[PDB]
Amino acid sequence: NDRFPPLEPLPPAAESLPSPLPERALTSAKLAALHARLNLSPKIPLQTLARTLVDASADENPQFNNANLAFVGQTLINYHIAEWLLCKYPRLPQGILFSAMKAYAGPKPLLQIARSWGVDTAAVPGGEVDPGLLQFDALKPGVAITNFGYKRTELAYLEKFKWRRGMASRVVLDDDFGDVVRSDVSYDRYGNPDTRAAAERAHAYFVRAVVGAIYAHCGREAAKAFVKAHIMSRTLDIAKLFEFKYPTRELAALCAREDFEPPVARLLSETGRQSRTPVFVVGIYSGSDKLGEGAASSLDHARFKAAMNALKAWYLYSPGENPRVPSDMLEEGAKPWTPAYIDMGEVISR
């Protein structure tokens, strides 16, 4: 009214648009602060950083939306992480290589990366909101980013009748993280487990787009440094992603494959036998060498725990903490490439 003039001058036909106009991004203090917070180069204008916040659920148009920036960005993150993970841990099983990829570039960590940048989400997408807010519609689930994975013919039978899928096929048919492909309005309601996932998906697409926008404007090297700084800088204990079934059987198959003599469990030290909380320290030996050590309260648990540590040591072998990656060659002249160790695959046993 007369006492309360509008704070932001906007035309009358602005609350109906799916998202704010491009020129609106040049007068918001949230974007200019979000641009300087991430130390983005001046090559990336504010109109491009404003397009990385408009999800595909708030605007259906191919342009004005984050759908195509998120795709190009997802490819860079998923690629730079995979090559770094294989060069660091060249023996990781395929199953754990998907959970480690998902632990770094998955929707969950990206959601924490988006929240670590001070990005506030918008209530409902509209042209009136300032472009500095992540705007999406969690109610609409008809949004899906194009993935290189294909749909499985037995998907219907897979979920209903619990058909077997297999790991070797997930590299081609499934998505990058091994997941299966294709797995008025009243706001008087509460949050839903689907909206919780849709909101998380929106944050993930924004972080990917920021890497895609950096690539288009600043080039390849700038994008790699961004992924290396914000995503790869995170810490993850890969040893905790291991779940074993009959480890003793797997260790025997490993020793049999590598020609190591049969493993023998030996009681290194013990105390408090015939007590409530005994301790049995057992070490599995291949001849004279000591493969793994395990200390538990039960004689059997100590032998199982020791077998897992022997397997973890094999799969978690790392040539170096900061190893060279194949991508270092395509850039400016660097040292000649040296062949990297290539493991022969995880052990399959009974």
């Binding site: 040049l26 007068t27 200019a32 001046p42 090559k43 204008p45 504010l46 109109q47 690539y215 288009a216 404007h217 600043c218 080039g219 390849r220 090297e221």
Partner: protein, 58 residues
């Protein structure tokens, strides 16, 4: 390495990296004098629609 700092007595003192060594303190009565990126600087960057990274870099 220091970051951009505003000194009340002197003025804004730009970031300096002593590893590659420069304490430049720009004082004035207009945003342009301070040496920071203003709204006008952000509008000339948004009108450079022809700039593009070289294909080899991309």
């Amino acid at each position: 390495k220091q970051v951009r700092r505003f000194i009340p007595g002197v003025g804004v003192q730009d970031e300096v990296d002593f590893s590659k060594v420069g304490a430049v303190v720009r004082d004035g009565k207009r945003a342009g004098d301070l040496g920071v990126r203003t709204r006008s600087d952000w509008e000339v960057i948004g009108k450079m629609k022809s700039v593009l990274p070289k294909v080899k870099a991309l």
